[PDB]
Design a binder for this molecule. Structure first.
Ligand code: ZN
Ligand code: ZN
Lengths: 359, 349
């Protein structure tokens, strides 16, 4: 009686992973997911070879997240039978950010694969998690990377052949903050259940979730109005809008249907010993891995991440509870995070002046 | 708590000069036109068509707000807009200009009457009854009520895709997907509002979740099958973003107020006169639908005198019988079969 999903995807990717022995049902669902994500958050395309590149970037990141052993962006440049530099070139060759985005993506595969493997207990991840909680601006920069937000703004530009359009770093940070805030606001109860740490409103105060969503949505509406008559920038708004919650309704990866076409929770609704032993013998906290990766910070890490890990890896703050061998913010850090959120509107109006010259 | 500030292009900023409504209302209305248009037509190439579409929606919004203010019969000049002129700006040079004019005038016609004293009259009683004659008929009329093929039409227009069109049967399936997606998500809200135009007032509540899943699957199949044709992506995008997501995205809806949750809250003279204007006002077939269906074909089916007295926390149209409920059930159950006949590129994977 109850609908079983059949997986649809274009034949371009249907014979990918010919070298990987995953059940054929699971390949289909990975391919379906990659197609569904692409179409939801990049709904317009002109360049099909770029669209397909992006699909392959998502395929790898799904597999990276499900069996981290398989996807070691440090070890080789051939991942799951794909040429990673070549696939990224297929997407970004001619675009202003190619170099910085290839670094963005490799950081994503590093942290994702390490988070979904024995290397979760390793110095590198430990230092990533502590550096998350360093400041709210740091949190969002790193949240951006975990979600491939600025990476997907670029790929959206790219896939519509908009090879000349780009953004200040301040702008990228506001755009991704809007998307990540929208997404984490909608996904709050799902993140709490499954015990997800990379969630804005696990750090930011819960009492401001509804206002933050309201303001981020209003500002993106404002920003879209300001950019009216420039269909090219409509693709940057589209990424942020569809990413920011709607994909929960549209992609089979999410549970809209299994949860009776509801999102969220009303006010009146209900609320590895041996793996840790045998990992310590294999010296899981590999500092030589960490230092080796800090050495390759021009290849594997986004601009400033190496300096972020070195300064914040052990936690800057004295009263904050950090990860030792996520972060529980102290009350003075909770208040500064709160202050950073509460003045979101000013912060975005500074970086995007066009918001104040409406008519 | 959050007090909305309204954003919209300047182009329509000084629309409705002629009309005397408070500037905030006009701000909310322009906002909704802009937001609906960006949500369900998220790409454009031709700005002057985009803006016509926004004007098409502005008028539609007010028709629903105050029907008395938009009477598409009375005159072709509504709220200082020339309807035929806006429609021409949007659809001139495109396959369905003439058909989409009718589509829209029906929408204004029916929405005005729904939201006015004319809800007690003979046209609307015949409309409500006609809705429930047949499931095919239901989806065709619901299509018009939601401007589904109108907006598929508009989305091609706004992207200068003047050569692209679909058969009646493809429009019927395209809009059935979109309207089944939307009416499955909005079930409880439609029921609270005593709506007549809700798919699951008529189709069975225990197929609501499955029908959504099935429509979302086939739309993914159609999308995949349309791989490498980014013109047709504009069509998929309309059905996808219309079929639920607008509830999250538009300030028209109550996602923020509901704490970022979804689904967790006897005179004949006018009727006759408009049926004689069927070429201008009614979509191809609606006259026959209204004439054959207006009084009800079925006899175990429970109708009403007028649909005028305002209802709440219950659907406010024909209550189908044991036998009609089963033929409707069956029309739903073969949805996948019907969609595969109409778009054979589905089974040819
Ligand atoms: Zn602290
Ligand atoms: Zn009956």
């Amino acid at each position: 009686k109850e609908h079983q999903d059949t997986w649809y995807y274009p034949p371009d990717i249907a014979n990918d992973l010919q070298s990987i022995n995953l059940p054929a049902e699971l390949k289909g669902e990975i391919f379906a997911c990659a197609w569904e994500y692409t179409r939801c958050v990049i709904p317009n395309y002109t360049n099909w070879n770029r669209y397909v590149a992006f699909m392959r970037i998502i395929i790898m990141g799904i597999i990276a997240e499900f069996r981290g052993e398989m996807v070691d962006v440090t070890a080789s440049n051939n991942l799951l039978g794909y040429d990673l530099d070549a696939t990224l070139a297929a997407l970004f060759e001619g675009t202003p950010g190619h170099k910085e985005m290839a670094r963005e993506y490799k950081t994503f595969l590093l942290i994702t694969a390490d988070k979904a493997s024995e290397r979760r207990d390793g110095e590198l991840f430990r230092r990533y998690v502590n550096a998350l909680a360093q400041s709210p601006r740091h949190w969002f920069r790193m949240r951006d990377c975990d979600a491939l937000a600025r990476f997907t703004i670029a790929s959206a530009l790219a896939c519509n052949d908009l090879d000349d359009i780009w953004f200040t770093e301040d702008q990228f940070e506001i755009l991704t903050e809007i998307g990540d805030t929208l997404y984490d606001a909608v996904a709050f109860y799902k993140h709490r259940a499954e015990g997800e740490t990379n969630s804005t409103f696990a750090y930011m105060p819960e009492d401001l979730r509804i206002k933050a969503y309201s303001e981020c949505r209003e500002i993106l509406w404002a920003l879209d109005a300001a950019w009216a008559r420039n269909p090219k920038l409509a693709n940057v708004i589209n990424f942020v809008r569809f990413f920011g919650g709607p994909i929960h309704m549209m992609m089979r990866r999410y549970r809209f249907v299994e949860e009776n076409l509801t999102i969220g929770k009303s006010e009146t609704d209900k609320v590895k010993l041996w793996n840790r032993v045998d990992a310590n013998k294999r010296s899981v906290l590999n500092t030589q891995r960490y230092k080796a990766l800090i050495a390759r910070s021009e290849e594997l890490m986004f601009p400033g991440l190496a300096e972020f890990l070195e300064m914040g890896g052990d936690g800057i703050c004295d009263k904050c509870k950090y990860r030792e061998s996520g972060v529980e913010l102290c009350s003075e850090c909770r208040l500064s995070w709160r202050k950073y959120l509460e003045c979101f509107v000013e912060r975005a109006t500074k970086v995007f002046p066009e918001l104040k010259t409406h008519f």
